[PDB]
Amino acid sequence: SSMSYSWTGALITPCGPEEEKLPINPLSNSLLRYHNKVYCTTSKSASQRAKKVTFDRTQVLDAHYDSVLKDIKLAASKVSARLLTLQQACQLTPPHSARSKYGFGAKEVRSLSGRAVNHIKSVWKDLLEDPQTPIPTTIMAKNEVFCVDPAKGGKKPARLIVYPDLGVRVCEKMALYDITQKLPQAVMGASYGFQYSPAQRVEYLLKAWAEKKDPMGFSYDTRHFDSTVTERDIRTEESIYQACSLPEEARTAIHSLTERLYVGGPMFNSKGQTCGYRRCRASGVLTTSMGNTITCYVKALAACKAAGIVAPTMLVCGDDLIVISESQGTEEDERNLRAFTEAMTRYSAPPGDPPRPEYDLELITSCSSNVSVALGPRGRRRYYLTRDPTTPLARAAWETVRHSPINSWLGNIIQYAPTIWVRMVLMTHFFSILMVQDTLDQNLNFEMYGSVYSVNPLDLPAIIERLHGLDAFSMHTYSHHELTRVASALRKLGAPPLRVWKSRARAVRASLISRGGKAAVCGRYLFNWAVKTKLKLTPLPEARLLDLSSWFTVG
RNA sequence: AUCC
Ligand SMILES: Nc1ncnc2c1ncn2[C@@H]1O[C@H](COP(=O)(O)OP(=O)(O)O)[C@@H](O)[C@H]1O
Ligand SMILES: [Cl-]
Ligand SMILES: [Mn+2]
Ligand SMILES: [Mn+2]
């Protein structure tokens, strides 16, 4: 049937100059030594990505699909969604959102300047009146940081980002923002993965696991998901949106966004040249996350029925999926997974790596993470979310004139606070750096799901207790997998081994303690793992007082 | 210089 993309041969050009690594990395050169291994993707590789994501989709649905989709529409029909006012939508624009071609930017949008508001009014009017003319988009290469991988070819090509003008982006929110906040939760319930903190994700997976008489679990991820989404998938997404009760004006804008933007359209590079035409998900539109997540769910659940998965419990985040189910014996389990993959493949969601059944929860990786186990203060098993620290360490070492890595250190410290790598390596580095700079009490930003939260370093103990529990400060006897993976990642980036971080941490602890106040609390709680004779850590009063519920939720 |  349809090609994901077609190309005119015009280059995908840089969206500004692309920042230079420097000869000295003064904030991370005591974290690790192999700076040569840390790179950022750029437009120079966009052509290679374009080639890998351009292909012909043929899609073949069946009765399991029809049946799932039907259930999902019923579920959607219970949702009432409203238009956002033009002004509400304006003010949800992020502060550095890329400016309009029409002579205004995010500052103006967010402040509701008259020029910007009037442009947007007219964009909205045109959406209500013209349901057909394709809306032009810009295509750009994503700049992201990774550690080189010789196994997988050295350096990954840049992902492709496709987005419409700022004025349209505002209009998307008027039409769909309220739906983005309600629909996924309504159609998926507990299966919607972007509602859970790391501890909650763990709790849910363990509960799912313990509920089966004889569990089997697997993960799945689609190769290049956005390019595999069909025009028909996208119109099906609309029909799911339209099943909610909406005012008529929303219906009209939603249909018009669908036909003019979401299903496809022409693409221009940053120099304004025609670059290509698209017939798949534009990653960059408002509906990217909701769309990916709902369409993944529909396909996956239909594929579960097709393969005969018994008592499936799912967890879906975009195109990342875990399914925990009742094992039918390893022989049938393996057949069932092949049938799952074949069905997903008919549905136009082929796998990156073929999935495989597992019967031990530590061995399942989804959303770049997995559940592991360690022992707590009282010797009980304690489960928590971890990941390979390779990419976090590489991002910990991205330092340019334009970019400081300190916020990424913080982000990882918060999300992965119970992990051996955060506690021994990143915490030790973070605190050492800030003490020496004398910036310990200076607020930093925590970035998550596109939101930004201001955090003071000296409040970490309370934040961590609240988010992960007091046991995050007393885990020991980490697992073989985790010890092996962390040691290996450190060697690979030329970082000191864990025993050296332990010595460093003793010294960081003592300095923190010597400063008194909140600093000393950080030393006692965050680095109790580092001393010979432990302290008895007690609940922090400030922790009871904190509400962090918005950090890890969409809705 | 995309969206959640
Ligand atoms: N930075 C991003 N901006 C917008 N959308 C994204 C981003 N990262 C991932 N996505 C969306 O989620 C999908 C799945 O991502 P992933 O599994 O990480 O890679 P792939 O695109 O190869 O499947 C993407 O195809 C894209 O539509
Ligand atoms: Cl314990
Ligand atoms: Mn994928
Ligand atoms: Mn994925």
Coordinates of C-alpha atoms (C1' of nucleotides) and ligand atoms in Angstrom, one line a residue:
Chain A
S1 CA 0.0 0.0 0.0
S2 CA 1.7 3.2 1.2
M3 CA 5.2 4.6 1.6
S4 CA 6.0 6.1 4.9
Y5 CA 7.9 9.0 3.2
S6 CA 9.0 10.3 -0.1
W7 CA 12.0 12.6 -0.6
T8 CA 12.9 15.3 -3.1
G9 CA 16.6 15.0 -2.4
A10 CA 16.9 18.3 -0.5
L11 CA 19.0 17.8 2.6
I12 CA 17.6 17.8 6.1
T13 CA 19.5 20.9 7.3
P14 CA 20.6 22.0 10.7
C15 CA 18.1 24.0 12.8
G16 CA 20.8 26.4 14.0
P17 CA 24.5 25.5 14.4
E18 CA 25.2 22.3 16.2
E19 CA 27.2 22.6 19.4
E20 CA 30.9 21.7 19.6
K21 CA 32.5 19.5 22.2
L22 CA 35.4 21.3 23.9
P23 CA 39.0 20.2 24.7
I24 CA 38.4 20.3 28.4
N25 CA 35.2 19.1 30.2
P26 CA 35.7 20.7 33.6
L27 CA 32.6 19.4 35.3
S28 CA 32.7 15.8 34.1
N29 CA 36.4 15.1 33.6
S30 CA 36.6 13.7 37.2
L31 CA 33.5 11.6 36.6
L32 CA 34.9 9.7 33.5
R33 CA 37.8 9.8 31.2
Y34 CA 36.6 8.4 27.8
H35 CA 35.1 11.6 26.5
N36 CA 35.9 10.4 23.0
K37 CA 33.0 7.9 23.4
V38 CA 30.4 10.5 24.2
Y39 CA 28.7 12.0 21.1
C40 CA 25.6 13.9 20.1
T41 CA 23.5 13.0 17.1
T42 CA 23.3 15.8 14.4
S43 CA 21.7 16.6 11.0
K44 CA 24.8 15.2 9.3
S45 CA 23.3 11.7 9.9
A46 CA 19.7 12.5 9.1
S47 CA 19.9 11.0 5.6
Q48 CA 20.9 7.7 7.0
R49 CA 17.9 7.7 9.3
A50 CA 15.6 8.8 6.5
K51 CA 16.7 5.7 4.5
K52 CA 16.1 3.4 7.5
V53 CA 12.6 4.7 8.1
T54 CA 11.3 4.9 4.5
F55 CA 9.4 1.7 3.5
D56 CA 6.2 0.4 2.1
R57 CA 3.5 -0.5 4.6
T58 CA 0.8 -3.1 4.0
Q59 CA -1.5 -3.7 6.9
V60 CA -3.9 -6.5 7.4
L61 CA -6.4 -6.3 10.2
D62 CA -8.6 -9.0 11.5
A63 CA -11.4 -9.8 13.8
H64 CA -9.4 -9.6 17.0
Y65 CA -8.4 -6.0 16.1
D66 CA -12.0 -5.1 15.3
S67 CA -13.2 -6.5 18.5
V68 CA -10.5 -4.6 20.6
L69 CA -11.1 -1.3 18.8
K70 CA -14.8 -1.6 19.4
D71 CA -14.2 -2.0 23.2
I72 CA -11.9 1.0 23.1
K73 CA -14.5 3.2 21.5
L74 CA -17.1 2.1 24.1
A75 CA -14.5 3.1 26.7
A76 CA -13.8 6.4 25.0
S77 CA -17.5 7.3 24.9
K78 CA -17.5 7.7 28.7
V79 CA -15.2 10.7 28.4
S80 CA -16.3 14.3 28.1
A81 CA -13.7 16.7 26.8
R82 CA -13.8 20.4 26.3
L83 CA -12.1 23.0 24.1
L84 CA -9.4 25.0 25.7
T85 CA -9.7 28.7 25.1
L86 CA -7.2 30.2 22.8
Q87 CA -5.6 31.8 25.8
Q88 CA -5.3 28.7 27.9
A89 CA -3.7 26.9 25.0
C90 CA -1.3 29.8 24.5
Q91 CA -0.1 29.6 28.0
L92 CA 0.6 25.9 27.8
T93 CA 3.3 26.7 25.2
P94 CA 6.8 25.9 26.7
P95 CA 9.0 28.9 27.2
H96 CA 11.5 28.0 24.5
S97 CA 9.0 26.6 22.0
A98 CA 10.3 27.3 18.5
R99 CA 9.1 30.6 17.1
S100 CA 6.5 31.2 14.4
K101 CA 7.4 32.0 10.8
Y102 CA 5.0 34.8 11.2
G103 CA 7.1 37.1 13.3
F104 CA 6.5 36.1 16.9
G105 CA 7.7 33.5 19.4
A106 CA 6.8 31.7 22.6
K107 CA 7.3 34.8 24.8
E108 CA 4.6 36.6 22.9
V109 CA 2.3 33.5 22.8
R110 CA 2.6 33.0 26.6
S111 CA 2.1 36.7 27.4
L112 CA -0.9 36.8 25.0
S113 CA 0.4 39.6 22.9
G114 CA -2.1 40.9 20.4
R115 CA -0.2 40.1 17.2
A116 CA 0.2 36.5 18.3
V117 CA -3.4 36.0 19.5
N118 CA -4.7 37.5 16.2
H119 CA -2.6 35.2 14.1
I120 CA -3.8 32.2 16.1
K121 CA -7.4 33.3 15.8
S122 CA -7.0 33.2 12.1
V123 CA -5.3 29.8 12.1
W124 CA -8.1 28.4 14.1
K125 CA -10.7 29.9 11.7
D126 CA -8.9 28.4 8.7
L127 CA -9.1 25.0 10.4
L128 CA -12.8 25.3 10.9
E129 CA -13.3 26.4 7.3
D130 CA -10.9 24.3 5.3
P131 CA -10.9 20.5 6.1
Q132 CA -8.5 19.5 3.3
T133 CA -5.5 21.6 2.4
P134 CA -2.3 19.9 3.8
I135 CA -0.5 21.9 6.5
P136 CA 3.2 22.4 5.9
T137 CA 5.7 21.0 8.4
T138 CA 9.4 21.4 9.2
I139 CA 11.6 18.4 9.4
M140 CA 14.7 18.3 11.7
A141 CA 17.2 16.0 13.2
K142 CA 17.0 15.5 16.9
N143 CA 20.2 16.2 18.8
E144 CA 20.7 13.6 21.5
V145 CA 23.6 12.2 23.4
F146 CA 24.8 8.6 23.6
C147 CA 27.9 6.5 24.3
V148 CA 29.3 4.9 21.1
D149 CA 28.4 1.2 20.6
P150 CA 30.8 -0.7 18.3
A151 CA 28.3 -3.7 18.3
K152 CA 25.5 -1.5 16.8
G153 CA 27.7 0.4 14.2
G154 CA 29.4 3.1 16.4
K155 CA 27.1 6.2 16.3
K156 CA 23.3 6.1 15.8
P157 CA 21.7 8.3 13.2
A158 CA 19.6 11.2 14.5
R159 CA 15.9 10.7 15.0
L160 CA 13.6 12.8 12.8
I161 CA 11.3 15.4 14.2
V162 CA 8.4 16.8 12.2
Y163 CA 6.3 19.7 13.4
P164 CA 3.9 22.4 12.2
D165 CA 4.2 26.1 12.8
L166 CA 3.8 27.5 16.4
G167 CA 0.3 28.9 15.6
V168 CA -0.9 25.5 14.6
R169 CA 0.7 23.9 17.7
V170 CA -1.3 26.3 19.8
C171 CA -4.5 25.4 17.9
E172 CA -3.8 21.6 18.4
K173 CA -4.0 22.2 22.1
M174 CA -7.3 24.1 21.9
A175 CA -8.8 21.1 20.1
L176 CA -7.1 18.1 21.8
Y177 CA -5.2 19.0 25.0
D178 CA -8.1 18.1 27.3
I179 CA -8.3 14.7 25.5
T180 CA -4.6 14.1 26.0
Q181 CA -5.3 14.5 29.7
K182 CA -8.2 12.1 29.9
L183 CA -8.5 9.6 27.0
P184 CA -5.6 7.3 27.6
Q185 CA -6.4 6.7 31.2
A186 CA -10.0 6.1 30.2
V187 CA -9.3 3.6 27.5
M188 CA -6.4 1.7 29.2
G189 CA -6.9 2.1 33.0
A190 CA -4.0 0.7 35.0
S191 CA -2.3 -0.3 31.7
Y192 CA -1.4 3.4 30.9
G193 CA 2.2 3.5 31.9
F194 CA 2.8 7.3 32.2
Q195 CA 0.8 7.5 35.4
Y196 CA 3.4 5.8 37.6
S197 CA 6.4 6.8 39.5
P198 CA 9.3 4.4 39.4
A199 CA 8.2 2.8 42.7
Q200 CA 4.6 2.5 41.5
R201 CA 5.7 0.9 38.2
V202 CA 7.6 -1.6 40.2
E203 CA 4.7 -2.2 42.6
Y204 CA 2.3 -2.8 39.6
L205 CA 4.7 -5.2 37.9
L206 CA 5.2 -7.2 41.1
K207 CA 1.5 -7.3 41.8
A208 CA 0.8 -8.5 38.2
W209 CA 3.6 -11.1 38.6
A210 CA 2.3 -12.4 41.9
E211 CA -1.3 -12.7 40.6
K212 CA -0.5 -15.3 38.0
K213 CA -0.5 -19.0 39.1
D214 CA 2.5 -19.4 36.8
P215 CA 3.7 -16.1 35.3
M216 CA 5.5 -15.5 32.0
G217 CA 6.4 -12.0 30.9
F218 CA 7.8 -10.4 27.8
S219 CA 8.6 -7.0 26.4
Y220 CA 8.0 -5.6 22.9
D221 CA 9.1 -2.5 21.1
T222 CA 8.3 -1.6 17.5
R223 CA 11.1 -0.8 15.1
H224 CA 10.7 2.9 14.1
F225 CA 7.2 3.2 15.4
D226 CA 6.3 6.5 13.9
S227 CA 7.0 5.4 10.3
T228 CA 5.0 2.3 10.7
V229 CA 1.8 4.2 11.7
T230 CA -0.6 4.2 8.7
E231 CA -3.0 6.8 7.4
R232 CA -5.7 4.4 8.5
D233 CA -4.3 4.1 12.0
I234 CA -4.4 7.9 12.2
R235 CA -8.0 8.2 11.0
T236 CA -8.8 5.4 13.5
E237 CA -7.2 7.6 16.2
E238 CA -9.6 10.3 15.2
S239 CA -12.6 8.0 15.4
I240 CA -11.4 7.1 18.9
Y241 CA -11.2 10.9 19.8
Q242 CA -14.6 11.5 18.2
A243 CA -16.2 8.8 20.4
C244 CA -15.8 11.1 23.4
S245 CA -18.6 13.7 23.9
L246 CA -17.1 16.9 22.5
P247 CA -18.6 20.3 21.4
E248 CA -19.1 20.5 17.7
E249 CA -16.5 23.0 17.1
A250 CA -13.8 20.6 18.6
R251 CA -15.1 17.8 16.3
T252 CA -14.6 20.0 13.3
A253 CA -11.1 21.1 14.3
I254 CA -10.1 17.6 15.2
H255 CA -11.2 16.2 11.8
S256 CA -9.4 19.1 10.1
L257 CA -6.2 18.5 12.0
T258 CA -6.5 14.8 11.2
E259 CA -6.9 15.3 7.5
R260 CA -4.5 18.2 7.1
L261 CA -1.7 17.5 9.5
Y262 CA -1.9 14.1 11.3
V263 CA -2.4 11.7 8.4
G264 CA 0.3 13.3 6.3
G265 CA 1.6 16.3 4.5
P266 CA 4.6 18.0 2.9
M267 CA 7.8 18.6 4.8
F268 CA 10.3 21.5 4.4
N269 CA 13.8 21.7 5.7
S270 CA 15.0 24.6 7.9
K271 CA 16.2 26.5 4.7
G272 CA 12.5 26.5 3.5
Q273 CA 13.1 23.9 0.7
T274 CA 10.7 21.1 -0.1
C275 CA 12.1 18.0 1.5
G276 CA 9.6 15.3 1.1
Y277 CA 6.1 14.1 1.8
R278 CA 4.9 12.1 4.8
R279 CA 2.2 9.5 5.2
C280 CA 2.9 8.5 8.8
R281 CA 3.1 9.8 12.4
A282 CA 4.7 13.2 12.6
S283 CA 6.7 13.0 15.8
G284 CA 6.2 16.6 17.0
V285 CA 2.4 16.9 16.9
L286 CA 0.4 17.1 20.0
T287 CA -1.1 13.7 19.6
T288 CA 2.3 12.0 19.3
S289 CA 2.3 10.4 22.7
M290 CA -1.4 9.7 23.2
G291 CA -1.6 8.4 19.6
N292 CA 1.4 6.1 19.9
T293 CA 0.3 4.8 23.2
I294 CA -3.4 4.2 22.2
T295 CA -2.5 2.7 18.8
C296 CA 0.2 0.5 20.4
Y297 CA -2.3 -0.7 23.0
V298 CA -4.9 -1.6 20.3
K299 CA -2.5 -3.5 18.2
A300 CA -0.9 -5.2 21.2
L301 CA -4.1 -6.3 22.8
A302 CA -5.4 -7.6 19.5
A303 CA -2.1 -9.4 19.0
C304 CA -2.4 -10.9 22.5
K305 CA -5.9 -12.3 21.6
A306 CA -4.5 -13.5 18.2
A307 CA -1.6 -15.4 19.9
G308 CA -3.8 -16.8 22.7
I309 CA -2.0 -15.0 25.6
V310 CA -3.9 -16.0 28.8
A311 CA -4.8 -13.4 31.4
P312 CA -2.7 -10.6 30.0
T313 CA -1.8 -7.7 32.2
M314 CA -0.2 -4.9 30.1
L315 CA 1.8 -1.9 30.7
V316 CA 2.2 0.5 27.8
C317 CA 4.3 3.6 27.3
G318 CA 4.2 4.7 23.7
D319 CA 5.4 1.8 21.6
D320 CA 7.0 0.1 24.7
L321 CA 5.1 -2.7 26.1
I322 CA 5.3 -5.3 28.8
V323 CA 2.8 -8.2 29.1
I324 CA 2.6 -10.4 32.1
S325 CA 0.4 -13.5 31.6
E326 CA -0.3 -17.0 32.5
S327 CA 2.4 -19.3 31.2
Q328 CA 1.2 -22.2 29.0
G329 CA 4.5 -24.1 29.3
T330 CA 7.6 -22.9 27.6
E331 CA 6.9 -24.7 24.4
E332 CA 3.5 -23.1 23.9
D333 CA 4.8 -19.7 25.4
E334 CA 7.4 -19.6 22.6
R335 CA 4.9 -20.4 19.9
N336 CA 2.5 -17.8 21.3
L337 CA 5.1 -15.1 21.2
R338 CA 5.9 -15.8 17.5
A339 CA 2.2 -15.6 16.8
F340 CA 2.1 -12.3 18.7
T341 CA 5.0 -10.9 16.6
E342 CA 3.4 -12.1 13.4
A343 CA 0.1 -10.5 14.3
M344 CA 1.8 -7.2 15.3
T345 CA 3.6 -7.4 12.0
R346 CA 0.4 -7.8 10.1
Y347 CA -0.9 -4.8 12.0
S348 CA 2.1 -2.7 10.8
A349 CA 4.1 -2.8 14.1
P350 CA 7.1 -5.0 13.4
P351 CA 9.6 -5.6 16.2
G352 CA 13.1 -4.2 16.7
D353 CA 14.2 -7.4 18.4
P354 CA 12.0 -10.5 18.4
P355 CA 10.4 -10.8 21.8
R356 CA 11.2 -13.7 24.1
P357 CA 9.4 -15.2 27.1
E358 CA 10.9 -14.8 30.5
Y359 CA 10.1 -16.3 33.9
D360 CA 12.2 -14.0 36.1
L361 CA 11.2 -10.4 36.4
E362 CA 14.7 -9.0 36.4
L363 CA 15.2 -10.2 32.8
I364 CA 12.5 -8.0 31.3
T365 CA 13.5 -4.6 30.0
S366 CA 10.9 -1.9 28.8
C367 CA 11.2 1.8 28.7
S368 CA 14.9 1.4 29.0
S369 CA 14.4 0.0 32.6
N370 CA 13.9 -3.1 34.6
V371 CA 13.0 -4.2 38.1
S372 CA 15.8 -5.5 40.3
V373 CA 16.2 -6.6 43.9
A374 CA 18.4 -5.8 46.8
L375 CA 18.2 -6.3 50.7
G376 CA 16.9 -3.6 53.0
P377 CA 17.9 -2.4 56.5
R378 CA 16.0 -5.3 58.1
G379 CA 17.3 -7.9 55.6
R380 CA 14.0 -8.1 53.6
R381 CA 13.9 -8.2 49.8
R382 CA 13.4 -4.8 48.3
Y383 CA 12.5 -4.3 44.6
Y384 CA 13.2 -1.1 42.6
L385 CA 13.6 0.3 39.1
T386 CA 17.0 0.4 37.5
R387 CA 18.5 0.7 34.1
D388 CA 21.8 0.4 32.2
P389 CA 23.7 3.5 33.3
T390 CA 25.6 3.9 30.0
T391 CA 23.4 6.6 28.6
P392 CA 22.9 8.4 31.9
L393 CA 26.7 8.6 32.2
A394 CA 27.2 9.8 28.7
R395 CA 24.7 12.6 29.3
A396 CA 26.4 13.3 32.6
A397 CA 29.4 14.2 30.4
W398 CA 27.8 16.4 27.8
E399 CA 29.3 19.9 28.5
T400 CA 29.3 22.7 25.9
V401 CA 29.2 26.5 25.8
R402 CA 25.4 26.1 25.6
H403 CA 24.8 23.1 27.8
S404 CA 25.5 22.1 31.4
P405 CA 25.0 18.5 32.4
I406 CA 24.2 19.2 36.1
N407 CA 20.4 19.0 35.6
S408 CA 20.8 15.5 34.0
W409 CA 22.8 14.4 37.0
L410 CA 19.9 15.6 39.2
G411 CA 17.2 14.0 37.0
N412 CA 18.9 10.6 37.3
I413 CA 19.5 11.0 41.0
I414 CA 15.8 11.5 41.5
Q415 CA 14.4 8.8 39.2
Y416 CA 17.0 6.2 40.1
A417 CA 17.9 7.1 43.7
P418 CA 17.8 3.5 45.0
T419 CA 20.3 2.2 42.4
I420 CA 23.8 1.3 43.2
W421 CA 25.1 3.6 40.4
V422 CA 23.2 6.7 41.5
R423 CA 24.1 6.2 45.1
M424 CA 27.8 5.5 44.7
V425 CA 28.7 7.4 41.5
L426 CA 26.3 10.2 40.5
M427 CA 25.4 11.3 44.1
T428 CA 29.1 11.4 45.0
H429 CA 30.0 13.4 42.0
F430 CA 27.0 15.7 42.2
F431 CA 27.6 16.7 45.8
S432 CA 31.4 17.0 45.4
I433 CA 31.0 19.4 42.4
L434 CA 28.4 21.6 44.1
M435 CA 30.3 21.8 47.4
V436 CA 33.5 22.9 45.6
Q437 CA 31.5 25.4 43.5
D438 CA 29.7 26.5 46.7
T439 CA 26.3 26.2 44.9
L440 CA 24.8 23.5 47.2
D441 CA 21.8 25.7 48.1
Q442 CA 21.2 26.9 44.5
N443 CA 18.0 25.6 42.9
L444 CA 18.2 23.4 39.8
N445 CA 15.7 22.2 37.3
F446 CA 14.3 18.6 37.3
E447 CA 13.0 17.8 33.7
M448 CA 10.3 15.0 33.1
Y449 CA 7.7 14.4 30.4
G450 CA 8.5 17.9 29.1
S451 CA 7.8 19.5 32.5
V452 CA 10.3 21.3 34.6
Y453 CA 10.3 21.4 38.4
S454 CA 12.6 23.6 40.5
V455 CA 14.5 21.6 43.1
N456 CA 17.0 22.4 45.9
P457 CA 19.9 19.9 46.3
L458 CA 19.6 20.1 50.0
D459 CA 16.1 18.8 49.9
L460 CA 17.1 15.6 48.2
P461 CA 16.8 13.5 51.3
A462 CA 13.1 14.4 51.8
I463 CA 12.4 14.2 48.1
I464 CA 13.9 10.7 47.9
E465 CA 12.2 9.4 51.0
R466 CA 8.9 10.6 49.6
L467 CA 9.4 9.2 46.2
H468 CA 11.1 5.9 46.9
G469 CA 10.9 5.3 50.7
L470 CA 13.5 5.3 53.5
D471 CA 14.8 2.0 52.3
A472 CA 16.4 3.9 49.3
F473 CA 19.1 5.0 51.9
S474 CA 19.9 1.5 53.2
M475 CA 19.8 -1.1 50.3
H476 CA 22.7 -3.5 50.1
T477 CA 23.6 -6.8 48.5
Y478 CA 22.6 -5.7 45.0
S479 CA 22.2 -8.4 42.3
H480 CA 24.7 -10.1 40.1
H481 CA 23.2 -8.6 37.0
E482 CA 23.3 -5.1 38.4
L483 CA 26.8 -5.4 39.9
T484 CA 28.1 -6.7 36.6
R485 CA 26.3 -4.2 34.4
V486 CA 27.4 -1.2 36.5
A487 CA 31.1 -2.3 36.7
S488 CA 31.1 -2.8 33.0
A489 CA 29.5 0.5 32.2
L490 CA 32.1 2.3 34.4
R491 CA 35.0 0.5 32.7
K492 CA 33.5 1.3 29.2
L493 CA 33.4 5.0 29.9
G494 CA 36.7 5.1 31.7
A495 CA 35.2 6.0 35.1
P496 CA 36.6 5.0 38.5
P497 CA 35.4 1.6 39.7
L498 CA 33.0 1.4 42.6
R499 CA 35.6 0.9 45.3
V500 CA 37.2 4.3 44.4
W501 CA 33.7 6.0 44.5
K502 CA 33.4 4.6 48.0
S503 CA 36.6 6.4 49.1
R504 CA 35.5 9.5 47.4
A505 CA 32.1 9.2 49.1
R506 CA 33.6 9.0 52.6
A507 CA 35.3 12.3 52.0
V508 CA 32.2 13.9 50.5
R509 CA 30.1 12.7 53.4
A510 CA 32.5 14.2 56.0
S511 CA 32.5 17.6 54.3
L512 CA 28.8 17.7 54.1
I513 CA 28.5 16.7 57.8
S514 CA 31.1 19.4 58.7
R515 CA 28.8 22.1 57.2
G516 CA 25.8 21.3 59.5
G517 CA 22.2 22.1 58.7
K518 CA 20.6 20.5 55.6
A519 CA 24.0 19.6 54.1
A520 CA 24.7 17.4 57.1
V521 CA 21.4 15.7 56.7
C522 CA 22.3 15.0 53.0
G523 CA 25.6 13.5 54.2
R524 CA 24.0 11.3 56.8
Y525 CA 21.1 10.0 54.7
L526 CA 22.5 9.9 51.2
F527 CA 25.9 8.5 52.2
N528 CA 25.1 6.1 55.0
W529 CA 26.1 3.3 52.6
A530 CA 29.7 4.7 52.6
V531 CA 30.6 4.4 56.4
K532 CA 31.8 1.4 58.4
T533 CA 29.4 1.7 61.3
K534 CA 26.0 2.7 60.0
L535 CA 23.7 5.3 61.5
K536 CA 20.0 4.6 62.3
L537 CA 18.0 6.7 59.8
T538 CA 14.6 7.8 60.8
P539 CA 11.7 9.2 58.8
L540 CA 12.1 12.8 57.8
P541 CA 9.3 15.1 58.9
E542 CA 9.7 17.2 55.7
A543 CA 9.0 14.1 53.7
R544 CA 5.4 13.8 55.1
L545 CA 4.8 17.3 53.9
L546 CA 5.7 16.9 50.2
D547 CA 3.4 16.4 47.3
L548 CA 5.3 15.0 44.3
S549 CA 2.3 13.4 42.6
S550 CA 2.6 15.5 39.4
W551 CA 6.2 14.6 38.7
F552 CA 5.4 11.2 37.2
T553 CA 1.9 11.6 35.9
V554 CA 0.3 12.8 32.6
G555 CA -3.4 13.8 33.3
Chain B
rA1 C1' 15.3 25.2 17.3
rU2 C1' 8.9 19.1 18.2
rC3 C1' 5.0 17.0 21.4
rC4 C1' 3.6 14.6 26.1
Ligands
LIG1 N1 12.1 13.1 21.2 C1 10.9 12.7 20.7 N2 10.0 13.6 20.2 C2 8.8 13.2 19.8 N3 8.4 11.9 19.7 C3 9.2 10.9 20.1 C4 10.6 11.2 20.7 N4 11.2 10.0 21.1 C5 10.3 9.0 20.8 N5 9.1 9.6 20.2 C6 8.0 8.8 19.7 O1 7.9 7.5 20.2 C7 8.1 6.5 19.2 C8 8.9 5.3 19.7 O2 10.2 5.7 20.1 P1 11.4 4.6 20.2 O3 10.8 3.2 20.5 O4 12.3 5.2 21.3 O5 12.1 4.7 18.8 P2 11.6 4.3 17.3 O6 11.1 5.6 16.7 O7 12.8 3.7 16.6 O8 10.5 3.3 17.6 C9 8.8 7.3 18.1 O9 8.7 6.6 16.8 C10 8.2 8.7 18.2 O10 7.0 8.7 17.4
CL2 CL 14.4 -4.5 55.2
MN3 MN 10.4 1.6 19.0
MN4 MN 10.1 2.4 22.3

